[PDB]
Design a protein around this ligand. Structure first.
Ligand SMILES: *[C@@H]1O[C@H](CO)[C@@H](O)[C@H](O)[C@H]1NC(C)=O
Ligand SMILES: *[C@@H]1O[C@H](CO)[C@@H](O)[C@H](O)[C@H]1NC(C)=O
Ligand SMILES: *[C@@H]1O[C@H](CO)[C@@H](O)[C@H](O)[C@H]1NC(C)=O
Lengths: 50, 57
């Protein structure tokens, strides 16, 4: 395992889908909020029904 | 442009990400986008322009 900062791992995952990494760093707060919100929907999806 | 920025402690370099081979940071190892204010953890360092010595002829 080679350590890397999470926002730099996400830049290399963005380059992997053909979106240039500045599109992450210029939107990092938005992308973090969208991810944190989407994990929040998983708790509701699994709490409200089996 | 494709790589990582890294530092040995005093100098900044760009490398390919799967094998340490440090290159001097230049306007053709890199690409621009926008002002410095937007990016978390950006650092102040000089980018070398390879045209500057040649156009100085
Ligand atoms: C970092 O690399 C440069 C390469 O020119 C060298 O001059 C410098 O001494 C190095 N610094 C350290 C802390 O090893
Ligand atoms: C990284 O961690 C250190 C120590 O917790 C902190 O001072 C620094 O602000 C963090 N980096 C960023 C980009 O905030
Ligand atoms: C980076 O360099 C600019 C120009 O010298 C300066 O205005 C700015 O305050 C510097 N920022 C840091 C974090 O040193």
């Amino acid at each position: 395992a080679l350590q890397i900062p999470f926002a730099m791992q996400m830049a290399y995952r963005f380059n992997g889908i053909g979106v240039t990494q500045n599109v992450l760093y210029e939107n990092q707060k938005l992308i973090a909020n969208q991810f944190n919100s989407a994990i929040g929907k998983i708790q509701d999806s699994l709490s409200s029904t089996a | 442009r494709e790589g990582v920025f890294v530092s040995n402690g005093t100098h900044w370099f760009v490398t390919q990400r799967n094998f340490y081979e440090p290159q001097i940071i230049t306007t053709d190892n890199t690409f621009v986008s926008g002002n410095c204010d937007v990016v978390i953890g950006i650092v102040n360092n000089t980018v070398y322009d390879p045209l500057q010595p040649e156009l100085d002829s």
